[PDB]
């Protein structure tokens, strides 16, 4: 129970957890461990843990939170021998695995047995497991089948400052659960918390602040912000490799393309430095999320030895995204370059699209990056921006992800957890209640939720897609319209911002190009033609940047759309959604597609006010709109399906496609149930087309 007791147990010749003998590596590691800052307050932790259900723990980067606290908790439950496990949630998978291996080494056990990790598509745990590291998403997935989380006695949310929606949702679930289960302990850890906020959230939970730090990190700033960070970073790296002594380098960049380019740019410069200045060898390892794990774990490889003794030291440079921003202890790292940028998610409500954008990091992010040094040995962090900018310009904390995300998918994931009430589901920073309710009923009409508010198999499958639920339903139900691939492409195109560029000046030319890509019946089909042209010109080998520039298309969003198409396709193949397509020569090649649109966009339909008028009254609510000027369709029919709603001098609908009113009554009967449908001119029109159908189909 008390610290001295646990420490007395740790000194045992025989391992209390396996019954095997402690190797002296365990004891050397142990003597190293007891010099950590958090250790010097171990008891102070225990009697807080003993007397409180929820605890907030704050210690500087490298204090020993992630690796020592779960072990403390483990030794505190020693005399009881509970069948329940201890869970620790890292924000990234690499972190979870690395730390899991580390703690497995510290407890002198085999990884996967007593100490293990758990990630999607890979469970490294056994029936012997008492300590489990995992990602917050993985725990969030386990919570779907076990809403009480009976398998765990203590849960430790780590790096909870990131405010990722998985972390937020976890905090809310655990907060609601803590009133239900009193046998569950909850710890919240970070080096960069808004402590008072998290305390206030968890019923004024106590705070433990460990002031000590292992090794110092010498942070430096640039006298003036650099015009371009990339080559500023590369120049900094080369300057380190040249002037600075022995030590591995760590550099943070935004994207993967940028990382590769910078990687072999650094390589090409380094080789010249070798051939001209007799500099030591440098091995450059890239690191990003879409990499295969076996390449990700190559960053732990030892730095190359000097060419011959007494010569310039060889070293290892790691160019990575922000996945290495937290929780990583890469031994050998001394120098850390911080350009101060990250690819952060933003969200467009009108077009319903999530998109990434390079933005300045937060202060917490910067401190977290610099914290990757001074863990095993004293380090330095070269921040490529003014100290004044860091103190008075950088955001103090990362803006919550829930507020930058599609609430329909979020709500879908909440009902996926079985959260019966949302408005009184206490999120730390809750989204607008009405938006959540509208999201709920919109999910109800899409047959993703029952009238009772539970997951439809359709909705459950739609959650597996990285898309707006409507778009996802469209894609899933597309094979029933005999045009899966085309709808896949259209989906991927609607998953990205507007690919057509229409400059404020000289928009005539843009209209002319778009007219050359035009399809008379719908703008969606025009998008399809644009993508097909793109893939053709790419197939030739023609330069696609200049090609997109000339034909007034956005290379960024077309490329993004393409990658999205690949990923989506592989997902469909994984869950067994068959990709089929009617031949182009077929009579109903386009009608199939146009019908498949209504599978998900039946709620966004506009009817012409009257034959002579240009004004449209939308099916949703009753708002007067016009067809957006940038439209392709020459003569828009009485009924159109629109993908966007814009509000300017007058309200428009954008990216429209002509449909037939019968398709509405066919594809979405429950929504267009004329028995209970709202009174209005639309109901009248639909009753007319109905009556015609009755006539002809009773005639036989
Ligand atoms: N894989 C490892 N190899 C060597 N030393 C490590 C490793 N992981 C952690 N350490 C040491 O243990 C200390 C505690 O690290 P950690 O618990 O991850 O800190 P925190 O979780 O507080 O950020 C570090 O300062 C580091 O010196
Ligand atoms: F605070 Be430590 F770097 F996880
Ligand atoms: Mg940590």
TrEMBL record:
One record GO biological process: spliceosomal complex disassembly
Residues that bind Mg(2+) 1: 66, 158-159
Entry keyword annotation includes Translocase: no
SUPFAM superfamilies: P-loop containing nucleoside triphosphate hydrolases
Keywords attached to this entry: ATP-binding, Helicase, Hydrolase, Metal-binding, mRNA processing, mRNA splicing, Nucleotide-binding, Nucleus
Sites where the protein binds Mg(2+) 2: 66, 159
PROSITE patterns: DEAH_ATP_HELICASE, HELICASE_ATP_BIND_1, HELICASE_CTER
Coiled-coil region: none
Single GO term (MF): metal ion binding
Binding site for ADP: 62-67, 98, 331, 375
Function summary: Pre-mRNA processing factor involved in disassembly of spliceosomes after the release of mature mRNA.
GO CC annotation, single: post-mRNA release spliceosomal complex
Family statement drawn from the similarity comment of this UniProt entry: Belongs to the DEAD box helicase family. DEAH subfamily. DDX15/PRP43 sub-subfamily.
Keyword Cell membrane tagged: no
Residues of the Helicase C-terminal domain: 236-418
EC number: 3.6.4.13
Localization of this protein: Nucleus
Name this polypeptide is given: RNA helicase
Gene3D superfamilies: 1.20.120.1080, P-loop containing nucleotide triphosphate hydrolases
Helicase ATP-binding domain: residues covered: 46-211
Pfam families reported in the protein's UniProt record: DEAD, HA2_C, Helicase_C, OB_NTP_bind, WHD_HA2
């Amino acid at each position: 129970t008390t610290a001295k007791q646990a420490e007395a147990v740790e000194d045992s010749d025989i391992n209390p957890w396996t019954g095997q003998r402690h190797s002296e590596r365990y004891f050397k590691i142990l003597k190293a461990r007891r010099k950590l800052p958090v250790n010097k307050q171990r008891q102070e932790f225990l009697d807080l843990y003993h007397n409180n259900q929820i605890l907030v723990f704050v210690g500087e980067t490298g204090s020993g939170k992630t690796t020592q606290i779960p072990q403390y908790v483990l030794y505190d439950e020693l005399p009881h021998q509970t069948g329940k496990l201890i869970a620790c949630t890292q924000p990234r998978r690499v972190a979870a695995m690395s730390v899991a291996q580390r703690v497995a080494d510290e407890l002198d056990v085999k990884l996967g047995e007593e100490v293990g990790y758990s990630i999607r598509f890979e469970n490294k745990t056994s029936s012997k497991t008492l300590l489990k590291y995992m990602t917050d998403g993985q725990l969030l997935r386990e919570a779907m089948h076990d809403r009480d989380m009976s398998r765990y006695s203590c849960i430790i949310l780590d790096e909870a400052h990131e405010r990722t929606l998985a972390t937020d949702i976890l905090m809310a679930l655990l907060k609601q659960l803590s009133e239900r289960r009193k046998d569950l302990k909850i710890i919240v850890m970070s080096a960069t918390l808004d402590a008072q906020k998290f305390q206030s959230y968890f019923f004024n939970a106590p705070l433990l602040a460990v002031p000590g730090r292992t090794h110092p990190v010498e942070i430096f700033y640039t006298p003036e912000a650099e015009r371009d960070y990339v080559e500023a970073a590369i120049r900094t790296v080369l300057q380190i490799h040249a002037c600075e002594p022995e030590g591995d380098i760590l550099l943070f960049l935004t994207g993967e393309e940028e990382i590769e380019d910078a990687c072999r740019r650094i390589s090409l410069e380094v080789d010249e430095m070798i051939r001209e200045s007799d500099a030591g060898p440098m091995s450059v390892y890239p690191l990003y999320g879409t990499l295969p794990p076996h390449q990700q774990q190559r960053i732990f490889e030892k730095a190359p030895q000097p060419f011959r003794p007494g010569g310039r030291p060889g070293r290892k440079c790691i160019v990575a995204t922000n996945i290495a921003e937290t929780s990583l202890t890469i031994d050998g790292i001394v120098y850390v370059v911080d350009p101060g940028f990250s690819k952060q998610k933003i969200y467009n409500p009108r077009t319903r699209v999530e998109s990434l954008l390079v933005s300045p990091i937060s202060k917490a992010s910067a401190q977290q990056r610099a914290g990757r040094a001074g863990r095993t040995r004293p380090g330095k962090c070269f921040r490529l921006y003014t100290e004044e900018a860091f103190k008075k310009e950088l955001i103090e904390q990362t803006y919550p992800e829930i507020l930058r995300s599609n609430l329909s998918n979020t709500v879908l994931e909440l009902k996926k957890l079985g959260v019966e009430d949302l408005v009184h589901f206490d999120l730390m920073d809750p989204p607008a209640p009405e938006t959540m309710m509208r999201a709920l009923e919109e999910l109800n009409y899409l047959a993703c939720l029952d009238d009772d508010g539970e997951l439809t198999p359709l909705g459950n499958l739609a959650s597996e897609f990285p898309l707006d639920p409507a778009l996802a339903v469209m894609l899933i139900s597309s094979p029933e319209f005999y045009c899966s691939n085309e709808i896949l492409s259209i989906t991927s195109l609607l998953s990205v911002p507007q690919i057509w560029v229409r400059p404020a000046n000289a928009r005539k030319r843009a209209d002319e190009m778009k007219a050359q890509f035009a399809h008379p019946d719908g703008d969606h089909l025009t998008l399809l033609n644009a993508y097909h042209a793109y893939k053709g010109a790419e197939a030739r080998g023609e330069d696609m940047k200049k090609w997109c520039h000339e034909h007034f298309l956005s290379y960024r969003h077309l490329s993004s759309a393409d990658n999205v198409r690949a990923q989506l396709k592989k997902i469909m193949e994984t869950h067994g959604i068959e990709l089929v397509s009617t031949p182009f020569h077929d009579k109903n090649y386009y009608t199939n597609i146009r019908r498949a649109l209504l599978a998900g966009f039946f709620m966004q339909v506009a009817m012409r006010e009257s034959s002579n008028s240009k004004v449209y009254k939308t099916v949703k609510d009753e708002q007067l709109v016009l067809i957006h000027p940038s439209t392709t369709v020459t003569t828009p029919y009485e009924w159109v399906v629109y993908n966007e709603f814009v509000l300017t001098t007058k309200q428009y609908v954008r990216t429209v496609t002509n449909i037939r009113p019968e398709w509405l009554l066919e594809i979405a009967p429950v929504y267009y149930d004329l028995s209970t449908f709202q009174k209005g001119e639309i109901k009248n029109a639909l009753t007319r087309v109905a009556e015609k159908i009755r006539r002809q189909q009773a005639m036989k």
